Structures are given as C-alpha cells and as structure tokens.
Amino acid sequence: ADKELKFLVVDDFSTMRRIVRNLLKELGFNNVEEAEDGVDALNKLQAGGFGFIISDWNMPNMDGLELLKTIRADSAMSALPVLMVTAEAKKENIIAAAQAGASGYVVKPFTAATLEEKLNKIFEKLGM
C-alpha cells in the first residue's frame, strides 16, 4: 500500500481515535482523518479521496455495521477497505460483519503490530 493512503478513523471516543491515529503513524501512515460516528463519517467521505476506513462497532446515530453496509451499497465507495473494530469478539457479530462485507475484524485494544498484521492481510487480499 501507498504510505499516503488516506485513512478515515471512526469512533465516538476521541481518545481511541487518537490512539488508532498514532498507531497508524507508527506504521508510516500519516494521511489520517477522523469521524465521530457513521453519519459524520459518511459526510466526510462525500468529500472523496479516502482509501481505507477503520470503524468502531458501537457509535450513536449510525453504528459501525450500518456505516459498513452504507459504504458497500454505494456505487462510488463499494470497494473501500473497511476494518471493523470491536470491544468483544462475538460469533453473531463476526458473522454479521462477514455478511455486510467487512474487510477485517479486530478486537480493541490492539498493538501496532496487530494493526499492521490486519492491514497487510487486507492489502494482500485486495492486491494493494
């Protein structure tokens, strides 16, 4: 993947957004923006240029799964990589993420190494 790939980090908890952003920076990905929920995220996505989405599962107004579906059903954004982040891995949620088209699924908190590992699995799958 290109070091300048533009990421959108979505979470209603500001501290977690900062942490994910810092983890991305640690891996050399500096082009990162933030959104506080699914609605805010879609609003900023309408601006264009985004190449990767990392979204939390539980957020008000529009949660992670709802954001993911919206992206996948949109003609311009349908192929965007989306890594889902959750507080707890659950069978039902995992199957739901698969059905909706999640590129990845990871439990927080996670280290830089783990993030790197999840991103690389997605890049490889997508030939990025």
């Binding site: 891995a89 995992i94 993420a97 990845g104 699995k121 799958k125």
Partner: peptide
C-alpha cells in the same frame, strides 16, 4: 475463545 478464534481464522479475519 477457541471457537471464536477458529471462526475468525476460517473467515480470514
């Protein structure tokens, strides 16, 4: 946990 982990592994997550 073992099962959750195997599910994730099977799905490529």
């Amino acid at each position: 946990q073992d099962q959750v982990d195997d599910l994730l592994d099977s799905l490529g997550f």
